[model samples]
Target: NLSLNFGKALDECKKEMTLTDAINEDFYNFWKEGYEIKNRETGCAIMCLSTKLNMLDPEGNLHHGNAMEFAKKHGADETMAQQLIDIVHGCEKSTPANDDKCIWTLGVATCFKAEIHKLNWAPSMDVAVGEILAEV
Candidate 1:
């Protein structure tokens, strides 16, 4: 549920950020196998979503505390939240640096998504959308 609803509250952000369907397509197939993300806009959308959720620090990096709180709020346990934070931190360190925050963000997201799939923790696409729609 936490995984599913992680960005389920981002309707307003999507609009405010003026995200395109192509960019949002990456988000739609986020949990789908073989759907590689290459669009920079998707990363921008993610940054927007995270910012709206207060999940980022002033430096535009993951704010571990707020991110953990977000995870727990969405049903992640303390350990799960920590692991989630750890994954992002690891991804950030492992990914090569880029001047574009959007591009860098995409690299991190790609790494994080890989781990989520490895752990079999990716949420169901239908259920994810369903809950978001339910809220809307």
Candidate 2:
């Protein structure tokens, strides 16, 4: 649901940060198979969402305590919350090193999404878009 909330806020961030049309298209196809992300601007947008939600540590990685509380607040059980955090940490570790946080975060988001699809955790476009719009 955090992802849904993030999606809801996209246009607001897109207002200030510019991303290519191609990169922008990735967000539309996010739940589709073979959808890929490689844009630094996507990272910037994601960071904006994280900061807006107060979900990050000073180093820009997820604040574990805050993230856990968030998952529960959104109805994740203890096990589910840990799984989400585990995948996030896993992707962060597996992504190749990049000095720039924006570039690095795109890779991390891409990998985390890869794992989500592998687990069949992605919502359909219709469902996700509807939820996002409801919040908007």
Candidate 3:
């Protein structure tokens, strides 16, 4: 859910943003690493939700729907997942956008809803997320 161009967007607020990054990185990485294996789906769901809630690590590299997981859920295996993960990891290392607030969650939500609609998922959102969108 973390959108593209997250870091660059906050270039003007470096100090505040860095503090935000520290807080969010602790929170997000804790959840990501803590629940990666035992509850990948829930972890993925959390990543998506957090991005929607603007709780990301100031850099978009930590997005939940990265190439690896995206490929896996859509159509891929562990080996392929590792390959994409490596590639994306390298990209993150190089660019390190470092802007956590990506502003693309709404677009992602719309796209996800469309994808689910194709399969009759009806594209439902939780009450909290709905409230978030309403406020937005």
Local lDDT at 72 for model 1: 40
Better of 1 and 3 by TM-score: 1
Clashing residue pairs found in predicted model 2: none
Could you tell me how far off, in angstroms, the CA of residue 24 lies in candidate 3 after the best superposition? 26
Per-residue alpha-carbon lDDT of model 1 for 33-94, expressed as tens digits? Answer: 78887888777766666554332223332242444433444545557555655666778788
Minimal lDDT window, size 10, model 2: 127-136
Ten residues in a row with the worst lDDT in model 1? 127-136
Clash pairs detected, candidate 1: none
lDDT of 2 at 47: 52
C-alpha lDDT (0 to 100) for residue 61 of candidate 3? 26
In order, the Cα lDDT scores of the candidates are 0.55, 0.52, 0.32
lDDT of 2 by residue, 31-100 (tens): 4667665667767666545544422223232342444443444445457655655666777789899887
Candidate 2 off by > 4 Å: 1-12, 15-28, 54-64, 68-75, 120-136
lDDT of 3 by residue, 1-136 (tens): 4322224323323342333333233322322312222222222333334444333323322234433333334334546444433433333344323233232332333233333334322212232122222222
Worst 10 residues of 3 by lDDT: 121-130
